[PDB]
């Protein structure tokens, strides 16, 4: 079948510069008229069309980015590579290879993507999270469920595990998707339980930050 | 550039019922030769986009005949017959006859249920966070439909429109709801410097805005 791969250097900093490859099978490109080109997609957003290499070596770029885009190839090695320097926030992103031909007859459209690399451009360093429990505040109750929370703070690379005892406790629970502050990621979990439950029996939530070898247990005390 | 607009950017559904989603273009995107340029791509959660259509009206191979292509000129839709659980995503038109290539901003296909509203949950700084000499304020918006919502924090009963990130859960698989986090992060020299601490939501389920507060002093 036709396949195509992409690597890159997973981590770099602000000013650096990324240097991605495409490794490829099932077609060449050597072939007239075939090509090759890269879109990427940063974490929750659109598509971004960068640039697109031809068998005859013409190269087409996104305008925003010329000063920054090289694309190239090696066609006796199945390979086309991408080129960004001066890498900034901004170009975190999945970056995926495409095939594309100029014609109709080999498929003037993206049928064949990779799986996609994830580029993260941060100047951060490996840092721990503080945990915090979320009481509800006082006093009462006064329904018939409550809610806690936990509060993970400060942490950097992606990503932290959470659950709340030890995972026996697994639904009533939101545990939202991370969001930068900084430089340094926060995350958010909910959970709900029936009233009757809490303060009587004890709810912990369980935090494990593999890159800075935390893991903390902290348990939500009432008010 | 020639700009992609799709309409809606989410589209709720029902399994089973037909779905359209129009995308615009900027500029004609008829190429000088024939060639109307126009794909639609889906991208499920997790993958890679797919290609569905190609040249306004041509199913990719595989592509089951619920879906079609149709349209002209700057006016293109997508349509789905019967919507099946497969289908759920994001829908993506994509012009490839001008440099820049460019995709529309993408219509997520989610799932229609009643309307519900949030429960919503304040949480104070901790001991814990005060201690370490920062100072966040949470609220939890959970379980609400449909997905549009707003919220506020106010500070001795005045908007602080500063500070505050918010996180948004994906539709649940199990109740097709939609939960919310947003975090007012302050100093804890602001923090001590004011005492009434107000999130109110504001959502299609209430003329009136869910309004949960504390105050400082007495916790």
């Known amino acids: 079948q036709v396949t195509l791969k992409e690597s890159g250097p997973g981590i770099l900093k602000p000013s650096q510069t990324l240097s991605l490859t495409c490794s490829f099978s099932?077609?060449?490109?050597?072939?007239?008229?075939?090509?090759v080109g890269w879109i990427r997609q940063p974490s929750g957003k659109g598509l971004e069309w960068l640039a697109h290499i031809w068998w005859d070596d013409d190269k087409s770029y996104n305008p925003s980015l010329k000063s920054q885009l090289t694309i190239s190839k090696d066609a006796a090695r199945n390979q086309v590579f991408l080129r960004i320097t001066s890498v900034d926030t901004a170009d975190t992103a999945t970056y995926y290879c495409?095939?594309?031909?100029?014609?109709?007859?080999?498929?003037?459209?993206?049928?064949?993507w990779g799986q996609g690399t994830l580029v993260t451009v941060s100047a951060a360093k490996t840092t721990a999270p503080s945990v915090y429990p979320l009481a509800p505040v006082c006093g009462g109750t006064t329904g018939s469920s409550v809610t806690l929370g936990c509060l993970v703070k400060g942490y950097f690379p992606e990503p932290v595990t959470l659950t709340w005892n030890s995972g026996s406790l697994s639904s009533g629970v939101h545990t939202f998707p991370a969001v930068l502050q900084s430089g340094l990621y926060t995350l958010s979990s909910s959970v709900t339980v029936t009233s009757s439950t809490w303060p009587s029996q004890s709810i912990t939530c369980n935090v494990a930050h593999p890159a800075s070898s935390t893991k903390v247990d902290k348990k939500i005390e009432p008010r | 550039d020639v700009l992609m607009t799709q309409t809606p950017l989410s589209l709720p559904v029902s399994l089973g019922d037909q779905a359209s989603i129009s995308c615009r273009s900027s500029?004609?995107?008829?190429?000088?030769?024939?060639?109307?340029?126009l794909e639609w791509y889906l991208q499920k959660p997790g993958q890679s986009p797919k290609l569905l259509i190609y040249?306004?009206?041509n199913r990719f191979s595989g592509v089951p005949d619920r879906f079609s292509g149709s349209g002209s000129g700057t006016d293109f839709t997508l349509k789905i017959s019967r919507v099946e659980a497969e289908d759920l995503g994001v829908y993506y038109c994509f012009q490839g006859s001008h440099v820049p290539l460019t995709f529309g901003a993408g219509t997520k296909l989610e799932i229609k249920r009643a309307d519900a509203a949030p429960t919503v949950s304040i949480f104070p700084p901790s001991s814990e966070q005060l201690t370490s000499g920062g100072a966040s304020v949470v609220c939890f918006l959970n379980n609400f439909y449909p997905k549009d919502i707003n919220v506020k924090w106010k500070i001795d009963g005045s908007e602080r429109q500063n500070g505050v990130l918010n996180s948004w859960t994906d539709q649940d698989s199990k109740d097709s709801t939609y939960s919310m986090s947003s975090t007012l992060t302050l100093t804890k020299d602001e923090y001590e410097r004011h005492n009434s601490y107000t999130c109110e939501a504001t959502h299609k389920t209430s003329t009136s805005p869910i309004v949960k507060s504390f105050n400082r002093n007495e916790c």
């Open positions: 040249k306004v009206s």
């Open positions: 495409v095939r594309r031909a100029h014609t109709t007859v080999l498929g003037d459209w993206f049928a064949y």
């Open positions: 500029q004609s995107i008829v190429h000088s030769n024939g060639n109307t340029y």
């Open positions: 099932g077609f060449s490109l050597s072939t007239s008229g075939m090509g």
